[PDB]
């Protein structure tokens, strides 16, 4: 079964040089292209261009030529994109994204699987990893709050991802200092308050910190 | 360098509705047009490739068409969670564009918001200030007002819910230390649709 799994993602200093890495696993890598997509917030998908792990060349974009490098990395199953000069509008979520099917069928011709994208957000300012308070509960309604953190984003789970019905992760917010903040709350049995624990992870990966906070009554 | 036009923008169909979606190349192109489908939080995903044929194990609701430089997409009867954005690529001519996307939101009957609120944590008043939290949960349509006093609360939305089709809605209100200390009673004022009377929760603190 066919995972892309991407990391890298942070806040980059505008000019600077960040280095991303989808890690692909569930087939052989040599056989199919791996490429990249890229998303800005809110926007349309523009392509990247592709790298063939077999035989390592490249298929460009002339437009991102000069800044941008794929590569890939048949030891480690692991496709990189390198960005360099980086400026306030390559601030985007970046996909890496298979090419299937098998071979080259003249009539198919996709990105079949794609991994979960990752948000390389470049900006002067730094980064701080975020503070999550609890908001304490028929049902009953508990969350937690996460807040003053950057840069996007925060990926919030409940006991570590066996909780997902209910869940509300609601969209960060900018405060007029500049941190983000988000909330995200759960609903639950009152029945069960007594008797089941209820926590949440904060994992902030733009500064490789994740926190969890057991919310109580 | 092939521009593909997308339209509508976005649409609100109703559960069991059948949606169009066009998008129209800017120069010719053969078949070689293929439909994602990408739902919030998520990567896109692809439905319909060589503009017809169903990738494996995609609910055959789904069609792509074509006539001319014109492609259609067809939802043939549309479901909560089909709410999405979809996109064209056409892979004819380097480098590869996709469209600009079309919002399918779903229209369905009025729902109430449960409403819940949050005192501020004994752990985050140590920082000096004070956050409440009003929760609307779940309510259909999108339009509803927060009241506490203004000027301080932000407040955001949750996407469309691709079961139930409503929405969420965190209103915080982020006052200061012993600001908050000096009054006592806090509420949240939820005015909305579906509910007759304008609805109040609240917390004395203490």
């Known amino acids: 079964e066919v995972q892309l799994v991407e990391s890298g993602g942070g806040l980059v200093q505008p000019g600077g040089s960040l280095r991303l890495s989808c890690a692909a696993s569930g087939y052989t890598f040599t056989e199919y292209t791996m490429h990249w997509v890229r998303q800005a917030p809110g926007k349309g998908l523009e392509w990247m261009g592709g790298i063939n792990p077999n035989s390592g060349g490249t298929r460009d974009n002339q437009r991102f030529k000069g800044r941008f490098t794929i590569s890939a990395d048949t030891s480690k199953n692991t496709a990189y994109l390198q960005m360099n000069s980086l400026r306030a509008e390559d601030t985007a979520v970046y996909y890496c994204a298979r090419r299937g099917p098998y071979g080259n069928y003249y009539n198919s011709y996709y990105f079949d699987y794609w991994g979960q994208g990752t948000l390389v957000t470049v900006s002067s300012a730094s980064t701080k990893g975020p503070s999550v308070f609890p908001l304490a509960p028929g049902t009953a309604a508990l969350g937690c709050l996460v807040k003053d953190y950057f840069p996007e984003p925060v990926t919030v789970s409940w006991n570590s991802g066996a909780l997902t019905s209910g869940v509300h992760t609601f969209p960060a917010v900018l405060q007029s200092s500049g941190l983000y903040s988000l909330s995200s709350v759960v609903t639950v049995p009152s029945s069960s308050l007594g008797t089941q624990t209820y926590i949440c992870n904060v994992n902030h990966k733009p500064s490789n910190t994740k926190v969890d906070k057991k919310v109580e009554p | 360098d092939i521009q593909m036009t997308q339209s509508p923008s976005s649409l609100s169909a109703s559960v069991g509705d059948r949606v169009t979606i066009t998008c129209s190349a800017s120069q010719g192109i053969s078949n070689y047009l293929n439909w994602y489908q990408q739902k919030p939080g998520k990567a896109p995903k692809l439905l319909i490739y060589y503009t017809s044929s169903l990738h494996s194990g995609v609910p055959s609701r789904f069609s792509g068409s074509r006539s001319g430089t014109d492609f259609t997409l067809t939802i043939s009867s549309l479901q909560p969670e089909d709410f999405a954005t979809y996109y064209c690529?056409?892979?004819?001519?380097?480098?590869?564009?996709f469209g600009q996307g079309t919002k399918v939101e779903i229209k369905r009957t009025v729902a109430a918001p449960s409403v819940f609120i949050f005192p501020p944590s004994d752990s985050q008043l140590k920082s000096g200030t004070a956050s409440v939290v009003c929760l609307l949960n779940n309510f259909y349509p999108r339009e509803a007002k927060v009241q506490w006093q203004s000027g301080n609360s932000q407040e955001s939305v949750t996407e469309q819910d691709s079961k139930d089709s409503t929405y969420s809605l965190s209103s915080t209100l982020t006052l200061s230390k012993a600001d908050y200390e000096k009054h006592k009673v806090y509420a949240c004022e939820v005015t909305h649709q579906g509910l007759s009377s304008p609805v109040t929760k609240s917390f004395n603190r203490g």
């Open positions: 690529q056409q892979y004819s001519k380097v480098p590869w564009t």
